[PDB]
Amino acid sequence: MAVKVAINGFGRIGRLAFRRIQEVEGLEVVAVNDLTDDDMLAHLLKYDTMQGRFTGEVEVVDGGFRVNGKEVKSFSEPDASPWKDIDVVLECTGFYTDKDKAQAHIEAGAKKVLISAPATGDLKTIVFNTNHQELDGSETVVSGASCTTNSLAPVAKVLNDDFGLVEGLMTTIHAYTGDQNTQDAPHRKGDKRRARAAAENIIPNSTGAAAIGKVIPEIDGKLDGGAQRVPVATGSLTELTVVLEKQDVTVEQVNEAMKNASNESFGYTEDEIVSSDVVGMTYGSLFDATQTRVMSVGQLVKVAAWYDNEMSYTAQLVRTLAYLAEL
Amino acid sequence: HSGMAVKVAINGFGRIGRLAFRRIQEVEGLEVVAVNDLTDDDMLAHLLKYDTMQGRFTGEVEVVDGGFRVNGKEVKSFSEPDASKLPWKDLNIDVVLECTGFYTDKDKAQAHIEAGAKKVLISAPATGDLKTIVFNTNHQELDGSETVVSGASCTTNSLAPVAKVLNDDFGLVEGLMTTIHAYTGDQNTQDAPHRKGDKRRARAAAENIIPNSTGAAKAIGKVIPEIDGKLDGGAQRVPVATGSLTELTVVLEKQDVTVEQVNEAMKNASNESFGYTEDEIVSSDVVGMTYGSLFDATQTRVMSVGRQLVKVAAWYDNEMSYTAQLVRTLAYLAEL
């Protein structure tokens, strides 16, 4: 009733968007596509290890399930012919990370696709409250960027706008994700590092986030970095070390600039929080003023922002979805 | 060893498959000539070389044309979902170590035989009318004419030598088991759909106590016929990457027992498969051990009720303990 959504892939992101959508007025879910029975889908929506119990009546039917009395239709699998009989699709499989690949939901019936991942090809990449006003309403396929990109973009925008961003290096200390292995095991993408026991290791990994030029064109090329995946099930931290144009910067100046640009996607804190404190939060990024460092030898600037790589990213995606569907 | 050798093929190069491979390198004599799994050589070689719980493989692993070389010996590798296309006939495989978890059935494992392997040893409990073997409890029920054989489970290997002693020395009336078990690779990293419809095993493995069914106690009569139907129980999966505990609480015929008699009777049954300790150890102290079961004398108590009951507990490395037992049974079984 206002904005109708199909979710393809009822994984961590798919389920959290479902929950998120239940708290956002004007947005509904009408269909869910995944390869598993309804009972399993209902069960995994109801119970969440990190995010807690879904408050709300879930009960299973044949062609889907009921949530608070609203039926949701359930389907199965990828490409070839499943929506002929939606306002926007949330692509969540992690297997349409490409433009012509995600050109399949279009053929299938739905107006717009919001891809819950970075994607290749000729599409806009959107971080909400950094560059959503770039959306004009004619797009068929849109990337919602990554979790790390949504943590980094508002921070990078301020640094550039206020002090001039010359260059920067990032490290993200990142919760382990579902595409990592439980035990040491062959990995599908040939990543020898993600093949390892997720909850027992510090695992170095690549990330595309630092592709920031797709969200903030004016700093394209200026950033790089990577990830270290560690044994927390959700909640992550992005450290950013930069050279700035404006050479006489102080800790409080950077902190004040961050505070001044806060909004519902970009929070600010001066408390001495740890990763589990950000679990379930709805800012896409939470700037941590306690971690700001300026390094002078006659400057390098370091900053850190927290994000729940689940709910932070999800909240941002549902915001982009809503803005995409008021189109 | 060449044409000489007892040729082992490993199907499924997971935790059990790689550990079996390591054991076989150690033991020597028999040769892993082929490995099948659906991934490239570089991944296989890397995962053999580095191991989160079990430590660095000592010895040279290098990626060559047909597969990989371990300490100069070429191992052939294949990427094949259907095991009946496997070139077992061409390589004259003697035993396929079936470790994929997808062929845990007498009939199903026959695919390997069609492909040309003489014998299959399944690294898990299996249905139907096959022999289920715990080394040093019942490996001698084998005669060398079997084509498909089960190596039982990790839990069953921890339990059987304990149960045997209780029955032989005191008479087992009835008993309850709980195994607090390390999480396994078929469990999910994050909350997601499980491959076999299991809602519990569907949950984040490293963040939950997860109730789980095990056949170990009910199917103990496959290994120890004289106590068929006398045990039951289940499992809880918990956030340790390996290392497991079996608790067993039993009623004995002798109603005049002591902690000392029980511990003494366990002690005097020790072998390579059944260890004994008197130290208050924890799960991480059994990582990498090659006993199939380690009896922990510090946990024995004699309780009364209304009725004398006896509680005992045995540690196992559900990985290396099981694997050591499997390779013992494999060595015994290439034959006749």
Add this chain to the structure above:
Amino acid sequence: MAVKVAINGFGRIGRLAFRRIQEVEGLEVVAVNDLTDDDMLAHLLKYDTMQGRFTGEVEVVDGGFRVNGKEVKSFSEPDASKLPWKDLNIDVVLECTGFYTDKDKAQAHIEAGAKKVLISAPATGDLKTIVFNTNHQELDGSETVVSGASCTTNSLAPVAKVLNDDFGLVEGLMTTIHAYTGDQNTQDAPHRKGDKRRARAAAENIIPNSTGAAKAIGKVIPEIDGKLDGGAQRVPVATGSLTELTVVLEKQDVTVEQVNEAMKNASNESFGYTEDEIVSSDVVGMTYGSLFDATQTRVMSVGDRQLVKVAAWYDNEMSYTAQLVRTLAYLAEL
């Protein structure tokens, strides 16, 4: 009567009882004792790894800290006999340090000027051990020291009671698979009680452990005294625990559903029921003292007998704490 509560030892139970007492009209925490500064106390009340952010204003004022405008006095006095409890008109101390778990020893608080002590753990001596909604009406209000029992005892008692009342309990064996606690060690190190197993890295081991919950169940349910035994394994989850109980019942041909139904039918503010296949993290933050899991019910033959296994989840933190504050309020009301 807004009854005045002092909390001694502002650890996991301490802080959680504080959060619960916010939702109880006519209980107000006026003092907190722990050996640390105000800033640390206020921070740890605000942020909680497993239980989530405290909603409401916490601010460090000069003499202690303010929660939603109400001042809470703080002290860091290691010797409980020295606390200014007379001076502050304390009715009841929630004794949560783990160092006064004895009737005579908890008397120190009475010495200090407090009227009653409720100990957040099993205790020895001449006092009552109370599991709310199983035996709290043993309290007549003349008690000066009371034990709130254990987390495990609270999970087990309503289950045991139903088995006994409806089927007759002959004997029973319990295992609790238990979250690791604060008195456990981060790394291998010496342990206060001399426990060589609690000495070990808590988040890296299955750790066998003694519990009195099954043996001392006769303190809470006299009619089954001596009928249960069992132990615990501490495992690497930060909170959320399970109690398995296997028993012999004085009733023939009992089905899984018949046991399940009798549990459901006894359900109240302390005893919940579920028919979903949940896991430990699903009970984090729940306020039932025990949650019966109908999906883990089995009826097995072991040799000419039927053994019935049941399982009950508890959040060894919030479940216990909810039970404790119920008992605290009941005691206050009398």
Add this chain to the structure above:
Amino acid sequence: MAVKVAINGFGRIGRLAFRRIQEVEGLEVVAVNDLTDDDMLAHLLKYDTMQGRFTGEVEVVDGGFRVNGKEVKSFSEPDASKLPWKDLNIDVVLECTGFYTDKDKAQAHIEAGAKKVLISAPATGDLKTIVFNTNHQELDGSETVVSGASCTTNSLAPVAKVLNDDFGLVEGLMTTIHAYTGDQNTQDAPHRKGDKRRARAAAENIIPNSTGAAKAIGKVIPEIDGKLDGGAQRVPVATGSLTELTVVLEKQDVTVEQVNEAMKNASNESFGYTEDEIVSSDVVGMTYGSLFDATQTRVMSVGDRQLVKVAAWYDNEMSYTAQLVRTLAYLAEL
């Protein structure tokens, strides 16, 4: 030439130093001081969660303490200076309690009649700070109190030395992703040493934390004094850590392989080199003080000043311990 050692504080570092010393010819332990009984000490030397079983006979036979037949004396004396050092046959006391991390404070061991103290931690006052194979040749044998630096400093120093010697170091930022340690708490709970972040459940959080390693690097490598800064994130692995370093260098046109090759060319027993894509648990038990990981080198170039990123692994237990025992042996040749 058979160096005799007293270990004060039989914690992680103390026990590992004990073990390490059993593999090093010419060095032996004669006394251990900690506040706990022999049985607990023997038990914790025998079994180790991360480092594995101690091979070798440990017995509390006869209410004493024996390792492979050699008796080790144990004391339970919290008053360092009340220790029997002026009796007893010592060459060096290893101070591992974390409570004497100051030149004057560590003098208690000397007043007790001791001769030399080696502190297993950073320390204040007028003493030399030593990272073996970076600045040990600064030791002349006349020092009474010496600091063995930190785990992080030992991982960082050989990396920083090569960057400076070969490329010129202008400035640099460090982050160490660090295993949690035993002074961290198991459950959110007040920390005595009131760190609001180390107060939090160690195995369930990413915990930001200060380290002196970058700022105090000038104590080990004087020519780069003031050129480095950074901090730590404590994460849920029980041991094994990583140090990332991002630097501006003097030699502007540097490449990944050049930095890598320079690192390789400086390797020795304290400083290792790897080109495999390993993870933390692969360094558990290793005896290099620092292991350079060539797979993680990054050069960032936009036509300003180049940023170079490098990472070195360390087992914050055994790496540090191996370095400490090398410094112990060396101090004891001079």
